[PDB]
């Protein structure tokens, strides 16, 4: 019973939610939802998407 972390948004993934993507260099990317999956597939940087965990700790939002 494991809660994963979304590789784009840092969102907590409960069982069943979102998808898992295995890249050509076999790196596992877990996505909580299709929003994160599509933004990853658009090659968007999570550090510039203003609601992600990576953005908020890069900008020191709420700490």
């Amino acid at each position: 019973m494991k809660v994963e972390i979304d590789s784009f948004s840092g969102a907590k993934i409960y069982p069943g939610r979102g998808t898992l993507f295995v890249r050509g260099d076999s790196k596992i990317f877990r996505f909580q939802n299709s929003k994160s999956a599509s933004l990853f597939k658009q090659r968007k940087n999570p550090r510039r998407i203003a609601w992600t965990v990576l953005f908020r700790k890069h900008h020191k939002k709420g700490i």
Binding site: P15, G16, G18, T19, L20, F21, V22, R23, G24, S26, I28
Partner: protein, 136 residues
Amino acid sequence: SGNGAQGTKFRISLGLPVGAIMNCADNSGARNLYIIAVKGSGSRLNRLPAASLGDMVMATVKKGKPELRKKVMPAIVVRQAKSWRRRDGVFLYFEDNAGVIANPKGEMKGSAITGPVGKECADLWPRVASNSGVVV
């Protein structure tokens, strides 16, 4: 599927019908595999025989060595690139479609698989799992 398979398989979503060209993961000298059939397929009118991960397919080689080209040969699908659900709830998919050349008894023609391999394929075919590196 038939002979060589070590166990059963839960149903994986079919993503590779006939006519699908997948990459050739092993080092046997082929570059792609063109799926001409699926072993253990179902006989329904108009319905294409469709493969999924871990399935043994009949395949030709469209790009590769001339000694592998223009022949029918068995292959095993090792990567699917179509989203399928595991019974642990995880809908996963790969980046590309990939298979390895084998003989009908399941032993693999090549010696080393380049890339990840699905866990159902590795558990169904021990010769794929022996030469596989990372599994999923």
